[PDB]
Amino acid sequence: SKGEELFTGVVPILVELDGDVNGHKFSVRGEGEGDATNGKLTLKFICTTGKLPVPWPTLVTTLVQCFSRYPDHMKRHDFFKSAMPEGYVQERTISFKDDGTYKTRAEVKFEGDTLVNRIELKGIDFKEDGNILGHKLEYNFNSHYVYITADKQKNGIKANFKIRHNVEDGSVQLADHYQQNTPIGDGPVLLPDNHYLSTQSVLSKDPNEKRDHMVLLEFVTAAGITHG
């Protein structure tokens, strides 16, 4: 609730990712802003180590669900904002079908007035000629159903969902996501009934940017619980 008050306006965001995929080391830094009232994120990401060794779309889910719009009747199911400002740890396994896996650990919390997402990512078992290391994924993004459930044992939540990455040959590269979030602080948090986040994104480029980069606009709303 006091967490929720932190998101009523536009909030600056910083994202920092250190990654290693099949031994290829890279870093990404992003900045922008979140407008949870409208479920809206606007960010630009830079690969600060040179060329990104995986396709940008594969990093989108790893690179701040506290910016989701929860409808009024669902505000008591918003774990993400309730954990703020101290924040939460977000961990995933992302299994790319017929290919490698990403394991990610992030902390999402306020540092001053900025919402910061700091991530470590480790990718293993990728095919060198596959859709990821071969850069055969379209530079776009689909709309998803992020199913959330509550982990009463860990005082947090779990989520599961399938990301669909369109491939240049017209096929689709699935990326199965298994997610767990736990609060960093010890204060009370909201543990939700089953529900989902409905997501949508577009990816674009900044014509004046020479570095390897991604411009992202994303909208997310919570749903799946009937108004009483």
PDB file of C-alpha atoms in Angstrom:
ATOM      1  CA  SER A   1       0.000   0.000   0.000  1.00  0.00           C
ATOM      2  CA  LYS A   2       2.798   2.389   0.933  1.00  0.00           C
ATOM      3  CA  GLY A   3       4.597   0.489  -1.796  1.00  0.00           C
ATOM      4  CA  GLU A   4       1.708   1.294  -4.140  1.00  0.00           C
ATOM      5  CA  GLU A   5       2.014   5.021  -3.395  1.00  0.00           C
ATOM      6  CA  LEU A   6       5.473   4.904  -4.962  1.00  0.00           C
ATOM      7  CA  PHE A   7       3.953   4.197  -8.423  1.00  0.00           C
ATOM      8  CA  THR A   8       1.137   6.735  -8.798  1.00  0.00           C
ATOM      9  CA  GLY A   9       3.202   8.935 -11.125  1.00  0.00           C
ATOM     10  CA  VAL A  10       6.061   8.460 -13.610  1.00  0.00           C
ATOM     11  CA  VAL A  11       9.064   6.702 -12.073  1.00  0.00           C
ATOM     12  CA  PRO A  12      12.598   6.689 -13.492  1.00  0.00           C
ATOM     13  CA  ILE A  13      14.052   3.237 -14.182  1.00  0.00           C
ATOM     14  CA  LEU A  14      17.635   1.904 -14.390  1.00  0.00           C
ATOM     15  CA  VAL A  15      18.387  -1.647 -15.631  1.00  0.00           C
ATOM     16  CA  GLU A  16      21.815  -3.292 -15.380  1.00  0.00           C
ATOM     17  CA  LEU A  17      22.515  -6.777 -16.704  1.00  0.00           C
ATOM     18  CA  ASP A  18      25.722  -8.789 -16.613  1.00  0.00           C
ATOM     19  CA  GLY A  19      25.445 -11.859 -18.794  1.00  0.00           C
ATOM     20  CA  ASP A  20      27.405 -14.889 -19.931  1.00  0.00           C
ATOM     21  CA  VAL A  21      25.934 -17.115 -22.645  1.00  0.00           C
ATOM     22  CA  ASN A  22      28.024 -20.107 -23.775  1.00  0.00           C
ATOM     23  CA  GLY A  23      31.072 -18.210 -22.496  1.00  0.00           C
ATOM     24  CA  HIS A  24      30.210 -15.003 -24.342  1.00  0.00           C
ATOM     25  CA  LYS A  25      30.304 -12.205 -21.754  1.00  0.00           C
ATOM     26  CA  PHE A  26      28.230  -9.059 -22.221  1.00  0.00           C
ATOM     27  CA  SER A  27      26.662  -6.187 -20.335  1.00  0.00           C
ATOM     28  CA  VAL A  28      23.464  -4.237 -20.949  1.00  0.00           C
ATOM     29  CA  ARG A  29      22.419  -0.929 -19.436  1.00  0.00           C
ATOM     30  CA  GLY A  30      18.944   0.499 -19.811  1.00  0.00           C
ATOM     31  CA  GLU A  31      17.162   3.641 -18.765  1.00  0.00           C
ATOM     32  CA  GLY A  32      13.694   5.014 -19.073  1.00  0.00           C
ATOM     33  CA  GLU A  33      10.500   5.384 -17.130  1.00  0.00           C
ATOM     34  CA  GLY A  34       7.485   3.499 -15.850  1.00  0.00           C
ATOM     35  CA  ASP A  35       3.894   4.661 -15.623  1.00  0.00           C
ATOM     36  CA  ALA A  36       2.023   1.970 -13.709  1.00  0.00           C
ATOM     37  CA  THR A  37      -1.217   3.940 -13.806  1.00  0.00           C
ATOM     38  CA  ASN A  38      -1.283   3.062 -17.503  1.00  0.00           C
ATOM     39  CA  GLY A  39       0.731  -0.155 -17.228  1.00  0.00           C
ATOM     40  CA  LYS A  40       3.338   1.496 -19.466  1.00  0.00           C
ATOM     41  CA  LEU A  41       7.107   1.137 -19.789  1.00  0.00           C
ATOM     42  CA  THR A  42       9.363   3.177 -22.070  1.00  0.00           C
ATOM     43  CA  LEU A  43      13.048   2.160 -22.137  1.00  0.00           C
ATOM     44  CA  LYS A  44      16.191   2.191 -24.196  1.00  0.00           C
ATOM     45  CA  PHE A  45      18.867  -0.453 -23.705  1.00  0.00           C
ATOM     46  CA  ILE A  46      22.510  -0.395 -24.796  1.00  0.00           C
ATOM     47  CA  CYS A  47      24.953  -3.244 -25.053  1.00  0.00           C
ATOM     48  CA  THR A  48      27.916  -1.639 -23.280  1.00  0.00           C
ATOM     49  CA  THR A  49      30.393  -4.384 -24.214  1.00  0.00           C
ATOM     50  CA  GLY A  50      29.973  -4.077 -27.989  1.00  0.00           C
ATOM     51  CA  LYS A  51      27.899  -6.514 -30.055  1.00  0.00           C
ATOM     52  CA  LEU A  52      25.184  -8.390 -28.186  1.00  0.00           C
ATOM     53  CA  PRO A  53      25.850 -12.128 -28.630  1.00  0.00           C
ATOM     54  CA  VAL A  54      22.185 -13.125 -28.432  1.00  0.00           C
ATOM     55  CA  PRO A  55      19.103 -11.540 -30.032  1.00  0.00           C
ATOM     56  CA  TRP A  56      17.625  -8.602 -28.171  1.00  0.00           C
ATOM     57  CA  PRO A  57      14.162 -10.183 -28.019  1.00  0.00           C
ATOM     58  CA  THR A  58      15.535 -13.054 -25.900  1.00  0.00           C
ATOM     59  CA  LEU A  59      16.434 -10.566 -23.125  1.00  0.00           C
ATOM     60  CA  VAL A  60      13.144  -8.637 -22.983  1.00  0.00           C
ATOM     61  CA  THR A  61      11.532 -10.583 -20.128  1.00  0.00           C
ATOM     62  CA  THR A  62      14.726 -10.495 -18.080  1.00  0.00           C
ATOM     63  CA  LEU A  63      15.223  -6.738 -18.551  1.00  0.00           C
ATOM     64  CA  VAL A  64      10.003  -4.742 -13.660  1.00  0.00           C
ATOM     65  CA  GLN A  65       6.505  -6.131 -13.184  1.00  0.00           C
ATOM     66  CA  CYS A  66       5.823  -3.599 -10.454  1.00  0.00           C
ATOM     67  CA  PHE A  67       4.888  -1.350 -13.414  1.00  0.00           C
ATOM     68  CA  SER A  68       1.933  -3.543 -14.367  1.00  0.00           C
ATOM     69  CA  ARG A  69      -1.508  -1.950 -14.075  1.00  0.00           C
ATOM     70  CA  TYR A  70      -3.570  -3.812 -11.518  1.00  0.00           C
ATOM     71  CA  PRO A  71      -7.278  -2.895 -11.845  1.00  0.00           C
ATOM     72  CA  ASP A  72      -8.847  -1.533  -8.664  1.00  0.00           C
ATOM     73  CA  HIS A  73     -10.598  -4.826  -7.814  1.00  0.00           C
ATOM     74  CA  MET A  74      -7.248  -6.595  -8.132  1.00  0.00           C
ATOM     75  CA  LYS A  75      -5.048  -4.153  -6.187  1.00  0.00           C
ATOM     76  CA  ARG A  76      -4.973  -6.528  -3.180  1.00  0.00           C
ATOM     77  CA  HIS A  77      -3.219  -9.086  -5.443  1.00  0.00           C
ATOM     78  CA  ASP A  78      -0.305  -6.830  -6.451  1.00  0.00           C
ATOM     79  CA  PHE A  79       2.696  -8.510  -4.786  1.00  0.00           C
ATOM     80  CA  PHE A  80       5.198  -6.517  -6.793  1.00  0.00           C
ATOM     81  CA  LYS A  81       4.340  -3.032  -5.586  1.00  0.00           C
ATOM     82  CA  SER A  82       3.638  -4.271  -2.014  1.00  0.00           C
ATOM     83  CA  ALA A  83       7.287  -5.337  -1.651  1.00  0.00           C
ATOM     84  CA  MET A  84       8.576  -1.823  -2.409  1.00  0.00           C
ATOM     85  CA  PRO A  85      10.665   0.128  -1.694  1.00  0.00           C
ATOM     86  CA  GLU A  86      12.903  -2.631  -0.243  1.00  0.00           C
ATOM     87  CA  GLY A  87      12.106  -4.728  -3.286  1.00  0.00           C
ATOM     88  CA  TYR A  88      12.166  -8.360  -4.369  1.00  0.00           C
ATOM     89  CA  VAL A  89      14.487 -11.000  -5.801  1.00  0.00           C
ATOM     90  CA  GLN A  90      13.273 -12.289  -9.148  1.00  0.00           C
ATOM     91  CA  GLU A  91      14.706 -15.581 -10.371  1.00  0.00           C
ATOM     92  CA  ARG A  92      14.002 -17.447 -13.585  1.00  0.00           C
ATOM     93  CA  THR A  93      14.859 -20.461 -15.620  1.00  0.00           C
ATOM     94  CA  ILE A  94      14.145 -19.799 -19.297  1.00  0.00           C
ATOM     95  CA  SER A  95      14.177 -22.926 -21.451  1.00  0.00           C
ATOM     96  CA  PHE A  96      14.488 -22.298 -25.183  1.00  0.00           C
ATOM     97  CA  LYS A  97      12.938 -25.324 -26.834  1.00  0.00           C
ATOM     98  CA  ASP A  98      15.494 -27.435 -28.745  1.00  0.00           C
ATOM     99  CA  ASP A  99      18.203 -25.089 -27.504  1.00  0.00           C
ATOM    100  CA  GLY A 100      19.868 -23.624 -24.400  1.00  0.00           C
ATOM    101  CA  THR A 101      18.712 -22.267 -21.047  1.00  0.00           C
ATOM    102  CA  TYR A 102      19.065 -18.917 -19.287  1.00  0.00           C
ATOM    103  CA  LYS A 103      19.214 -18.763 -15.525  1.00  0.00           C
ATOM    104  CA  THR A 104      18.647 -15.279 -14.129  1.00  0.00           C
ATOM    105  CA  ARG A 105      18.725 -13.654 -10.712  1.00  0.00           C
ATOM    106  CA  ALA A 106      17.734 -10.065 -10.273  1.00  0.00           C
ATOM    107  CA  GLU A 107      17.031  -7.611  -7.526  1.00  0.00           C
ATOM    108  CA  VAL A 108      14.316  -5.037  -8.160  1.00  0.00           C
ATOM    109  CA  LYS A 109      14.168  -2.180  -5.669  1.00  0.00           C
ATOM    110  CA  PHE A 110      14.259   1.558  -5.217  1.00  0.00           C
ATOM    111  CA  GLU A 111      17.582   3.322  -4.959  1.00  0.00           C
ATOM    112  CA  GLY A 112      16.523   6.824  -4.115  1.00  0.00           C
ATOM    113  CA  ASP A 113      13.630   7.752  -6.408  1.00  0.00           C
ATOM    114  CA  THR A 114      14.750   5.336  -9.151  1.00  0.00           C
ATOM    115  CA  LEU A 115      13.401   1.840  -9.639  1.00  0.00           C
ATOM    116  CA  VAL A 116      16.450  -0.326 -10.323  1.00  0.00           C
ATOM    117  CA  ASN A 117      16.586  -3.816 -11.842  1.00  0.00           C
ATOM    118  CA  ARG A 118      20.035  -5.402 -11.433  1.00  0.00           C
ATOM    119  CA  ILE A 119      20.455  -8.783 -13.100  1.00  0.00           C
ATOM    120  CA  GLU A 120      22.945 -11.611 -13.471  1.00  0.00           C
ATOM    121  CA  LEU A 121      22.276 -13.966 -16.381  1.00  0.00           C
ATOM    122  CA  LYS A 122      23.957 -17.290 -17.201  1.00  0.00           C
ATOM    123  CA  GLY A 123      23.156 -19.049 -20.451  1.00  0.00           C
ATOM    124  CA  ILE A 124      24.288 -22.602 -21.235  1.00  0.00           C
ATOM    125  CA  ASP A 125      23.792 -25.382 -23.781  1.00  0.00           C
ATOM    126  CA  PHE A 126      23.048 -23.114 -26.755  1.00  0.00           C
ATOM    127  CA  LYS A 127      23.417 -24.425 -30.303  1.00  0.00           C
ATOM    128  CA  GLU A 128      25.948 -22.384 -32.219  1.00  0.00           C
ATOM    129  CA  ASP A 129      23.890 -22.528 -35.401  1.00  0.00           C
ATOM    130  CA  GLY A 130      20.574 -22.355 -33.556  1.00  0.00           C
ATOM    131  CA  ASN A 131      18.019 -19.540 -33.514  1.00  0.00           C
ATOM    132  CA  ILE A 132      19.629 -17.744 -30.570  1.00  0.00           C
ATOM    133  CA  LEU A 133      23.374 -17.823 -31.271  1.00  0.00           C
ATOM    134  CA  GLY A 134      22.628 -17.781 -35.000  1.00  0.00           C
ATOM    135  CA  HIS A 135      20.546 -14.594 -34.710  1.00  0.00           C
ATOM    136  CA  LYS A 136      17.557 -15.982 -36.612  1.00  0.00           C
ATOM    137  CA  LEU A 137      14.873 -14.375 -34.446  1.00  0.00           C
ATOM    138  CA  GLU A 138      12.745 -11.525 -35.751  1.00  0.00           C
ATOM    139  CA  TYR A 139      13.206  -8.153 -34.080  1.00  0.00           C
ATOM    140  CA  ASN A 140       9.699  -8.034 -32.656  1.00  0.00           C
ATOM    141  CA  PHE A 141       7.666  -9.321 -29.725  1.00  0.00           C
ATOM    142  CA  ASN A 142       4.312 -10.957 -29.085  1.00  0.00           C
ATOM    143  CA  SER A 143       1.610 -10.591 -26.448  1.00  0.00           C
ATOM    144  CA  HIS A 144       1.593 -13.078 -23.555  1.00  0.00           C
ATOM    145  CA  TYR A 145      -0.276 -14.523 -20.570  1.00  0.00           C
ATOM    146  CA  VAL A 146       1.897 -14.441 -17.428  1.00  0.00           C
ATOM    147  CA  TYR A 147       0.190 -16.808 -14.934  1.00  0.00           C
ATOM    148  CA  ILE A 148       0.878 -15.891 -11.301  1.00  0.00           C
ATOM    149  CA  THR A 149       0.153 -18.069  -8.205  1.00  0.00           C
ATOM    150  CA  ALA A 150       1.564 -17.246  -4.679  1.00  0.00           C
ATOM    151  CA  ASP A 151       4.195 -19.215  -2.892  1.00  0.00           C
ATOM    152  CA  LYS A 152       2.955 -18.982   0.684  1.00  0.00           C
ATOM    153  CA  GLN A 153       5.969 -21.019   1.820  1.00  0.00           C
ATOM    154  CA  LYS A 154       8.499 -18.475   0.517  1.00  0.00           C
ATOM    155  CA  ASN A 155       6.251 -15.472   1.171  1.00  0.00           C
ATOM    156  CA  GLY A 156       6.251 -14.661  -2.516  1.00  0.00           C
ATOM    157  CA  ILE A 157       4.938 -15.667  -5.911  1.00  0.00           C
ATOM    158  CA  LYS A 158       5.643 -17.992  -8.777  1.00  0.00           C
ATOM    159  CA  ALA A 159       4.896 -17.437 -12.447  1.00  0.00           C
ATOM    160  CA  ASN A 160       4.910 -19.582 -15.489  1.00  0.00           C
ATOM    161  CA  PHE A 161       4.449 -18.700 -19.136  1.00  0.00           C
ATOM    162  CA  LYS A 162       5.573 -19.433 -22.647  1.00  0.00           C
ATOM    163  CA  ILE A 163       7.198 -16.667 -24.676  1.00  0.00           C
ATOM    164  CA  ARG A 164       6.804 -16.933 -28.428  1.00  0.00           C
ATOM    165  CA  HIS A 165       9.763 -15.607 -30.481  1.00  0.00           C
ATOM    166  CA  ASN A 166       8.980 -15.369 -34.222  1.00  0.00           C
ATOM    167  CA  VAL A 167      11.750 -16.832 -36.389  1.00  0.00           C
ATOM    168  CA  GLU A 168      12.894 -15.500 -39.783  1.00  0.00           C
ATOM    169  CA  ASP A 169      11.655 -18.682 -41.562  1.00  0.00           C
ATOM    170  CA  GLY A 170       8.113 -18.277 -40.264  1.00  0.00           C
ATOM    171  CA  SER A 171       8.492 -20.785 -37.424  1.00  0.00           C
ATOM    172  CA  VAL A 172       8.285 -19.927 -33.756  1.00  0.00           C
ATOM    173  CA  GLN A 173      10.945 -20.337 -31.091  1.00  0.00           C
ATOM    174  CA  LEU A 174       9.300 -21.060 -27.712  1.00  0.00           C
ATOM    175  CA  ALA A 175      10.939 -19.939 -24.480  1.00  0.00           C
ATOM    176  CA  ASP A 176       9.400 -21.550 -21.399  1.00  0.00           C
ATOM    177  CA  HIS A 177       9.634 -19.316 -18.341  1.00  0.00           C
ATOM    178  CA  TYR A 178       9.642 -20.502 -14.748  1.00  0.00           C
ATOM    179  CA  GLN A 179       9.768 -17.643 -12.270  1.00  0.00           C
ATOM    180  CA  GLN A 180       9.918 -17.126  -8.526  1.00  0.00           C
ATOM    181  CA  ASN A 181       9.893 -13.862  -6.610  1.00  0.00           C
ATOM    182  CA  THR A 182      10.608 -13.320  -2.920  1.00  0.00           C
ATOM    183  CA  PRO A 183      10.640 -10.083  -0.899  1.00  0.00           C
ATOM    184  CA  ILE A 184      13.973  -8.598   0.126  1.00  0.00           C
ATOM    185  CA  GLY A 185      12.561  -6.990   3.290  1.00  0.00           C
ATOM    186  CA  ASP A 186      10.543  -8.539   6.120  1.00  0.00           C
ATOM    187  CA  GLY A 187       7.521  -6.230   6.040  1.00  0.00           C
ATOM    188  CA  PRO A 188       4.115  -7.486   5.009  1.00  0.00           C
ATOM    189  CA  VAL A 189       3.397  -8.189   1.370  1.00  0.00           C
ATOM    190  CA  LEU A 190       0.338  -9.130  -0.656  1.00  0.00           C
ATOM    191  CA  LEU A 191       0.110 -12.799  -1.548  1.00  0.00           C
ATOM    192  CA  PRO A 192      -2.233 -13.028  -4.526  1.00  0.00           C
ATOM    193  CA  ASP A 193      -4.988 -15.344  -5.649  1.00  0.00           C
ATOM    194  CA  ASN A 194      -4.326 -16.934  -9.040  1.00  0.00           C
ATOM    195  CA  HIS A 195      -4.345 -14.400 -11.868  1.00  0.00           C
ATOM    196  CA  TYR A 196      -2.390 -13.318 -14.937  1.00  0.00           C
ATOM    197  CA  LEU A 197      -0.635 -10.396 -16.531  1.00  0.00           C
ATOM    198  CA  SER A 198      -1.635  -9.601 -20.107  1.00  0.00           C
ATOM    199  CA  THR A 199       1.417  -8.180 -21.901  1.00  0.00           C
ATOM    200  CA  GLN A 200       2.286  -6.482 -25.190  1.00  0.00           C
ATOM    201  CA  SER A 201       5.469  -4.912 -26.523  1.00  0.00           C
ATOM    202  CA  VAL A 202       7.113  -3.363 -29.550  1.00  0.00           C
ATOM    203  CA  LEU A 203      10.812  -3.221 -30.284  1.00  0.00           C
ATOM    204  CA  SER A 204      12.430  -0.518 -32.378  1.00  0.00           C
ATOM    205  CA  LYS A 205      15.685   1.307 -33.094  1.00  0.00           C
ATOM    206  CA  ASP A 206      16.886   4.882 -32.521  1.00  0.00           C
ATOM    207  CA  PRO A 207      18.113   6.153 -35.905  1.00  0.00           C
ATOM    208  CA  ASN A 208      20.772   8.308 -34.208  1.00  0.00           C
ATOM    209  CA  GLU A 209      22.199   5.475 -32.068  1.00  0.00           C
ATOM    210  CA  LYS A 210      25.366   3.780 -33.320  1.00  0.00           C
ATOM    211  CA  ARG A 211      25.687   1.299 -30.423  1.00  0.00           C
ATOM    212  CA  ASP A 212      23.914  -2.092 -30.415  1.00  0.00           C
ATOM    213  CA  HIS A 213      20.665  -1.202 -28.680  1.00  0.00           C
ATOM    214  CA  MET A 214      16.936  -1.786 -28.243  1.00  0.00           C
ATOM    215  CA  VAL A 215      14.124   0.695 -27.797  1.00  0.00           C
ATOM    216  CA  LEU A 216      11.142  -0.867 -26.021  1.00  0.00           C
ATOM    217  CA  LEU A 217       7.540   0.200 -25.401  1.00  0.00           C
ATOM    218  CA  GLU A 218       5.501  -2.201 -23.294  1.00  0.00           C
ATOM    219  CA  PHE A 219       2.004  -2.265 -21.763  1.00  0.00           C
ATOM    220  CA  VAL A 220       0.934  -4.750 -19.101  1.00  0.00           C
ATOM    221  CA  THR A 221      -2.343  -5.136 -17.232  1.00  0.00           C
ATOM    222  CA  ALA A 222      -3.353  -7.677 -14.615  1.00  0.00           C
ATOM    223  CA  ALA A 223      -6.498  -9.741 -15.228  1.00  0.00           C
ATOM    224  CA  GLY A 224      -8.158 -13.085 -14.509  1.00  0.00           C
ATOM    225  CA  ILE A 225     -10.100 -12.279 -11.349  1.00  0.00           C
ATOM    226  CA  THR A 226     -13.788 -11.533 -11.688  1.00  0.00           C
ATOM    227  CA  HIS A 227     -15.113  -8.346 -10.126  1.00  0.00           C
ATOM    228  CA  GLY A 228     -17.199  -9.206  -7.041  1.00  0.00           C
TER     229      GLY A 228
END
